[PDB]
Amino acid sequence: MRVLLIHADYFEYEVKDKALKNPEPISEDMKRGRMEEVLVAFISVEKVDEKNPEEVSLKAIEEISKVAEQVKAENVFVIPWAHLSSELAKPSVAMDILNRVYQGLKERGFNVGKAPFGYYIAAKISCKGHPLAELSRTIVP
Amino acid sequence: MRVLLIHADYFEYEVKDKALKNPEPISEDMKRGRMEEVLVAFISVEKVDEKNPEEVSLKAIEEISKVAEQVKAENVFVIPWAHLSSELAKPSVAMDILNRVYQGLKERGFNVGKAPFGYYIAAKISCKGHPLAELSRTIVP
């Protein structure tokens, strides 16, 4: 897995067209979302992650939590994001891991949002400029 | 080199603190910048690029141009961006390549902006949601 963490004044998204033929089902209220003062976690679930989804998930929850704790973010946005890897897992694995990460961060105590899987999504973000506001993590099994 | 290309309704930046001890010198007018209807090119110049800066640059100019042409972007923003690689080139090489890319895209005919090198920078972006609005490229020597 590769993760890009952005500490943002805001992040807001709007679902546009499907990218998979069978994307994650969404209600009307999941078509748009917004959070303020939020650590945005852009997550690229990789082929190698398939070997151990629980361990990868756990390590991602902690690595994300650690930054959230350090930058004093109470709000965390989990974004499925294909653009940090060229060896992406299959959708079942990606979705399994992304949900595990999401539930783990709620158990940690954060207020957590997520964008749905399998869509092209339009988005606005305002990235803070402090030294820890943009960070990369690589999480391996 | 790794590149992330974002077709954006807008991109606007504001320089905050230095990240290097000796960052790229800037005038007052380079502290903030904005473009609309712009292909934002986030560029991670890598250690391996040092082996051939002209060839890497040329290939980056073309790969960026191709997408700009395809999505009908006339405006291109060159952003130095550490977050697509863990084997980053030294600043002289990074800056040499980023300037080559910038000049090459002006020669192509685009209206081209750039953010200065060596800063922590705050930024707002609105990412279009069409199928080609977020793309990754890997450029090797």
DSSP B43-87: EE-BGGGGG-HHHHHHHHHHHHHHHHHHHT--EEEEEE-GGG-SS
A111: nearest Cα among A48, A54, A35, A44: A35
The domain segmentation of chain B, as residue ranges, is 1-139
Give B86-89's long-range contacts (Cβ < 8 A, gap of 24+): B86/A136, B86/A138, B87/B46, B87/B47, B87/B48, B88/B44, B88/B45, B88/B46, B88/B47, B89/B45, B89/B46, B89/B47, B89/B49, B89/B50
| C-alpha separations of A108 from A78, A97, A112, A138 in Å | 14, 16, 10, 21
Tokens of A62: 């902690």
User: Which H or E run contains B33?
Assistant: strand B32-44
User: Which H or E run contains A78?
Assistant: strand A75-80
Question: Could you tell me where the DSSP H helices lie in chain A?
Answer: 53-71, 91-108
**Residue B51's beta-bridge partner residues?**
none
| C-alpha separations of B104 from B58, B63, B99, B111 in Å | 8, 12, 8, 11
CATH number among 3.40.50.2000, 3.40.50.720, 3.50.80.10, 1.10.10.60, domain B1-139? 3.50.80.10
Contact assignment for B128 to A121 by CB distance below 8 Å: no
**Residue B13's beta-bridge partner residues?**
B33, B123
Contact assignment for A4 to B120 by CB distance below 8 Å: no
DSSP structural state of residue A99: H
Contact assignment for B123 to A133 by CB distance below 8 Å: no
For B17, the closest of A16, A124, A131 (CB atoms) is A131
The position carrying tokens 């640059």 is B57
| C-alpha separations of A111 from A5, A106, B17, B23 in Å | 16, 6, 29, 37
Tokens of B95: 């800056």
Strands B75-80 vs B111-114: parallel, antiparallel or unpaired = parallel
Nearest chain A CA: its distance from B19 CA (Å): 8
Gyration radius of chain A's alpha carbons: 14
- In a mutagenesis test of the A interface, which of B15, B126, B138, B139 is the best target, namely the one with the most A β-carbons within 10 Å? B126
Closest-approach residue (CA) in chain B for A84 = B84
Helix (H, G, I), strand (E, B) or coil at A63: helix
Resolution of the coordinates in A? 2.0
Contacting residues for A49 by C-beta, under 8 A, at least 6 apart = A1, A56, A89, A93, A97, A141
Contacting residues for B139 by C-beta, under 8 A, at least 6 apart = B1, B2, B3, B56, B59, B60, B63
* Chain centroid to CA B89: 15
Question: Distance between CA A56 and CA A102 in Å, rounded?
Answer: 13
| C-alpha separations of A74 from A36, A66, B79 in Å | 10, 12, 29
Closest-approach residue (CA) in chain B for A126 = B124
The amino acid sitting at A133 is A
Question: Distance between CA B57 and CA A77 in Å, rounded?
Answer: 35
